[PDB]
Amino acid sequence: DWGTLQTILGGVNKHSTSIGKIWLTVLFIFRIMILVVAAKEVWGDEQADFVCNTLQPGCKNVCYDHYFPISHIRLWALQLIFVSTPALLVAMHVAYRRHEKKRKFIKGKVRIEGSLWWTYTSSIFFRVIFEAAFMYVFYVMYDGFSMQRLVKCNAWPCPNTVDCFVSRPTEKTVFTVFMIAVSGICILLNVTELCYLLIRY
Amino acid sequence: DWGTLQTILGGVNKHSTSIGKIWLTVLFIFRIMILVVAAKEVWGDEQADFVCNTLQPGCKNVCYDHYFPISHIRLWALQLIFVSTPALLVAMHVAYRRHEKKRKFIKGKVRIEGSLWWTYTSSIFFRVIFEAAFMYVFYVMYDGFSMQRLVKCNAWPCPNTVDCFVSRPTEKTVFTVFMIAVSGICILLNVTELCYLLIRY
C-alpha cells in the first residue's frame, strides 16, 4: 500500500491555485520512483564488493563503517520519510478535523481556512526545513558532493594507511546527483509556496 | 673434517692419569653425535609447524620469536662450540709451543709442565665456566626445564591473548634432557679435573 494511499489524503480536494501544488507531488512520486530503483539495485554491493587491500581482520568492516555511517540509500530514504511526514500529518489533520466538525454540528469555514490553512503553512515551512536539513547532511557528512573510486581508510585495526575500493561509485554518484538535484528543485517549490503565503499574508 | 681432526690435537700424546681424561672426550664426541641427530631432524619443524590460532598477520612470527629467541639446537650448538674452544686452544697452544721450543734449541721440560700444564689447568676452569654458563641460560632462559605442547603468546600484533602450538615438544624435550644431563655429567668430569689440580696443587 506504498504511494497510492498517501495520495488519497495527500492530494486532497481543493486547496490553492499556484500550478506548484501538483508539480511538487508529481516529483514526490518521481523521487520515490528513482529511489525505489537505486536502493535494492545499486546499494546491495555497497558492503559486499567494498574491497580493502589488507589481510588485517578488523579493517574492512571498520573501513566501511568509518566511511559509510548512514549509507546514502538510507539517507535518501529518511529524507523521503521526514519530508513525507508534514504532507501526511496535514492531510491527517484535515480528514480528521473536517470529518469531526461536520458530523458534530449537523445534528447537534472561518476555522477551515483558519486551523487548516494555517497548519499547512507551517507544514510547508516544515517540508523545506527537512528537505534542507538532509540536503545539508548529504553534502556535509559525505566528503564533498560525490564518492571516489577508492578511499584511503585509516580505520583502527588496519595496518597504518590502507586502500579500499567502493562499488560503482559513479552509478552511485549519478543517483546522488538526481536525488540531490530533485532535492533542490523540491526545495524551491516548497519555498515558493512558503513565499505565496508570505505575499498575501 | 668435523670431529676427526679436533682429536688429532685434542687427544694428545700423554698428559695425566685419572681415567676421566678420555671419558670426558668420549662424551664430547657422544654429545656432538646426539646433537648432529637432533638438529637437522627435530628442529626443522620448530618454525614451520608452529601454529598460532589467529588470522592476525603479525602474530605467528612474533609468537615464535618472543618465545624461541635462540632456539635450542643453536644453543646446544654454541655450547659444543665454546666448550670446544678451550680444548682446541690448549691443544693449539701445545703443538705450537712444543714444536717451537724443540726445533729452535736443537740446532741453536720445566716449562713444558710449567707453561702448558698451567694453561691446561685454566682451560679446565674455562671448560666448566662455559659448560655451566650455558647450562645456566638453558635453564633460566627457557621457561622451566622443558617446553609445553601449546603456549599462550602475547606477541605484539596478536589480538589479545592467542594460542600457538609447538612441534613435538616432547621429542624436543627428550633431547633437552639428554643434552642437559650430559651437560651436567660433562661438568663434573671437568670439575674433577679442576679438583685433582687443586689437590696436589
Side-chain angles (χ1 to χ4, degrees), chain B residues 1-13 15 17 19-201:
Chain B
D1 26 323
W2 315 141
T4 198
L5 305 172
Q6 286 62 45
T7 311
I8 297 170
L9 287 191
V12 216
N13 289 9
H15 43 262
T17 59
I19 315 172
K21 320 302 304 172
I22 42 159
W23 245 51
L24 196 145
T25 276
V26 170
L27 290 203
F28 193 96
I29 296 177
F30 167 103
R31 184 188 176 80
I32 218 108
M33 270 333 202
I34 184 182
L35 181 160
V36 91
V37 146
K40 325 279 184 193
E41 203 108 19
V42 328
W43 303 80
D45 289 73
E46 70 198 356
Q47 169 99 309
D49 279 37
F50 182 69
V51 284
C52 291
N53 187 342
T54 159
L55 304 55
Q56 173 58 79
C59 195
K60 163 238 186 62
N61 279 13
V62 200
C63 281
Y64 181 90
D65 193 318
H66 197 44
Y67 264 65
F68 280 43
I70 319 150
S71 75
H72 294 211
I73 224 32
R74 258 129 293 175
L75 260 208
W76 293 137
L78 275 156
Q79 197 145 89
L80 284 257
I81 287 166
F82 272 55
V83 158
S84 186
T85 292
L88 282 195
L89 189 269
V90 163
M92 198 67 156
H93 182 215
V94 76
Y96 186 78
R97 280 206 178 269
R98 198 198 179 275
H99 169 279
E100 188 80 313
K101 297 168 191 284
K102 185 195 76 178
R103 205 199 160 269
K104 289 188 81 64
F105 302 112
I106 203 164
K107 293 177 196 67
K109 283 197 171 186
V110 195
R111 227 65 201 267
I112 215 165
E113 200 207 326
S115 288
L116 235 304
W117 268 226
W118 195 235
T119 58
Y120 178 104
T121 221
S122 255
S123 155
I124 285 176
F125 174 78
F126 268 160
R127 322 161 95 77
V128 217
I129 217 167
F130 289 153
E131 263 282 295
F134 291 1
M135 166 71 91
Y136 183 70
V137 158
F138 248 116
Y139 234 75
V140 173
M141 176 97 282
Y142 280 98
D143 289 316
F145 76 94
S146 64
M147 64 179 81
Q148 325 147 206
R149 267 190 196 175
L150 98 142
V151 83
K152 260 86 168 70
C153 158
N154 192 221
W156 159 48
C158 318
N160 329 319
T161 300
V162 319
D163 294 10
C164 305
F165 293 72
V166 208
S167 93
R168 26 213 176 173
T170 78
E171 188 168 271
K172 279 188 172 109
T173 284
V174 164
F175 280 34
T176 312
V177 147
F178 283 41
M179 299 275 310
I180 214 63
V182 158
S183 200
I185 284 161
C186 275
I187 277 164
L188 297 190
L189 299 210
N190 269 321
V191 88
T192 262
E193 251 68 308
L194 198 71
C195 192
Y196 271 33
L197 295 157
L198 276 172
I199 295 158
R200 75 182 64 195
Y201 221 110

